[PDB]
Amino acid sequence: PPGGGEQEPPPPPAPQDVEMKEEAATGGGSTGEADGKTAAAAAEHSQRELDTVTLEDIKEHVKQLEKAVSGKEPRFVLRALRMLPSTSRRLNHYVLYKAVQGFFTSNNATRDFLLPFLEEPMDTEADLQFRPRTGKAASTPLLPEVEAYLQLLVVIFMMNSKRYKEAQKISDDLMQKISTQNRRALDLVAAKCYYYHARVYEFLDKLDVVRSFLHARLRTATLRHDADGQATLLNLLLRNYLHYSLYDQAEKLVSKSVFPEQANNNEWARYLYYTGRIKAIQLEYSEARRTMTNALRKAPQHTAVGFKQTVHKLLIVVELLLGEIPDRLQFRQPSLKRSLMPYFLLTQAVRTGNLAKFNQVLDQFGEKFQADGTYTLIIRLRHNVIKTGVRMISLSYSRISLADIAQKLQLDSPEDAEFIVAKAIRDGVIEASINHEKGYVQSKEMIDIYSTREPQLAFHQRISFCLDIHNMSVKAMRFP
Amino acid sequence: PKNPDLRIAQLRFLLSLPEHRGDAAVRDELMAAVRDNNMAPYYEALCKSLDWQIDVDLLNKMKKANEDELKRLDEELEDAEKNLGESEIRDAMMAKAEYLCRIGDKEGALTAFRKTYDKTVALGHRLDIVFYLLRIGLFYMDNDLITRNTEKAKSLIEEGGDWDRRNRLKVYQGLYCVAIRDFKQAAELFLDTVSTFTSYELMDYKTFVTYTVYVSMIALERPDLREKVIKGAEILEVLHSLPAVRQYLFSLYECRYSVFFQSLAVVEQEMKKDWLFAPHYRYYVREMRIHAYSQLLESYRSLTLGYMAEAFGVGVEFIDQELSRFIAAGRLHCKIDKVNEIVETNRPDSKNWQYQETIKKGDLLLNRVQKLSRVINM
């Protein structure tokens, strides 16, 4: 009380007011945009949703006593908002419920009274007119309730708040959907609630009911219109299958599902990581590494997000598999710098033909290699080491004997030296030929590029692609 | 007061980082420790070499009586005599500043520099203050304040001067040779070497000759390199003074690879006795090794290693594994053959190399324009 009690009056009063005016003016701005000019493509629905991800999760984490988050439910318990005097009667109440809470105390939450703070706010003459207002005011208690992590009759209060909000979501898409279109708001609320519906299960069990409900919501979607609804519901259906053992259900999912080319640079980073993980495991490597690259160079405007740490983590693993030497010292950035020691030590022994060190690196860091999720190297790196040595010789030399390469690769068998290079040419490691007479392994023809149409094939991929950059940039720029 | 200080930091570096080299570095620096009133910057030299020795309290009361005499001198100057700007007050303040550099730590010196820098309205005094930061910034290898005062000199001071700046042309290349920037910028500004008298502003002239000649072979291969290192006059005399360096250039120019093999090893054992050779011991060798191979593999497309057994040096299998490490490095565009003993090169014809230069600079720009194109459009 002498030390921290003086710092108790300054935190409530001004952030209680300035946050409430922002969400009410935007909530009033969402109202006028819902009432007229529903073309809200560049409107404040996005930036307010960009606020609700960032600010409300890093500013407040508890229910904010002296009536800041706990006081919004007795503030919003008495709302009708139907007729123009009835709204102005409620507009009289908006000033009065803030003035009493701003002066004095009104109604306190003691972490148990969530049932009077969720039914009577849904009740007491509420309507269907202000649907994002009812959508946000039901989703705003979802953040501090999970973030408290107290676990004393809290899961069923989460479970009731989900099933209520999911019942409110069905009543919007089916009943009176004329010019409301809250899908830009209701998608991320569906994403954030399922994260909590998974993690709270993941404290205790699995999740199967969350996905059978997710197949139904995707079934009743996908027929109307695809505007980031089908995009975000796809990855939630795909992240769980990648979380468990099965890959076949994800494989048939990624097979036939066309895309709306509209996900606002937030799902494109995520999805191109998942399908790059899928094409890695069914051994389609060249298409995998380029779309693993495409997600990484998409949005580098993140500070230790973990995702940029993870898509970078798999990208150096797969470029070892193609023998395409992922950058031997460029991947120490100030962002990660610590998730490279199990991998800079890995690519060291992969580069040389050493195995006793490579077995030492693998056995020492095997606990790390299982935890992160890339323990699919155990079968795929013994192939890489034995093909790295024959690739280095075929790149350096031009005409080597089979006895000379068999002693160079510490193999001690000049009878399967023909077998290694036969598998090298069959797998496409190097283009060469073996003369089965006395051990002639010759290289290719004299390299001529500029005289056999090869600059045309590279340039034709460039012309048609960069005019497509132009045609996409023309059909985005003009607005009223 | 800051003149015999480039040798001290050599002797501090020579004793500290190698442990085998500890015979003579303790013998003469301990003479420089008891001299010079070196009483703040020696505890890193004292704890890491010897245990302790009692000469400490004697010089501390001498430097305290010297400080308190200089404490009472300039306060009596400012309280009795009234002049501002650049006056008897000013050169007494830099006499305190040159006391804190030679004797004291850097922390008293840096706060006296910033104090007297706003007590200046001329430019030559401000030029000398930035001379003082840049001289102590090289003494204590600070890569932090050199990012400021070099810009503050070139943009706010070095516009009224007239050839009073060649010294910090030599200081910036000294920071460039020690950081990494020893490719083409170091050899460019080391081309003009017209300074013979050595002073506060200049280092040892003999070591400046060795530094300007080790770098003048990496920037330019032979676009008339012989005009600027052989047809010179002031550089030709001082390399005529030294037998090894004059042997080192002639071995590279007349392509005596058997003794250029030896002359590179004599330089490299000499490289350990330096105070800035850290990105040199592992990078200057392999660059000069791959430069000797590259001009040797010119003018020959059917070269044999049976001729390499006597022309370049000796040995057979060492050159084979040496060339194999560099072909697999990505460099030295040539092929090697074992059972025919023909090192057949495949150097491009100034088209296929130029074809690579469009496709490497092209997609590097293309990945830049898409990453630009996705940050925008929400």
Binding site: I463, I469, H470, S473 | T358, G362
Partner: peptide, 30 residues
């Protein structure tokens, strides 16, 4: 191949200047 490079930077710059002028007239009209 320059026409692929240059003309893509032309219309991209015209996209940036419109998307700056769009959102700034939008954020200051209300």
């Amino acid at each position: 191949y320059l026409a692929s490079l240059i003309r893509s930077v032309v219309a991209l710059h015209n996209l940036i200047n419109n998307k700056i002028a769009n959102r700034d007239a939008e954020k200051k009209e209300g």
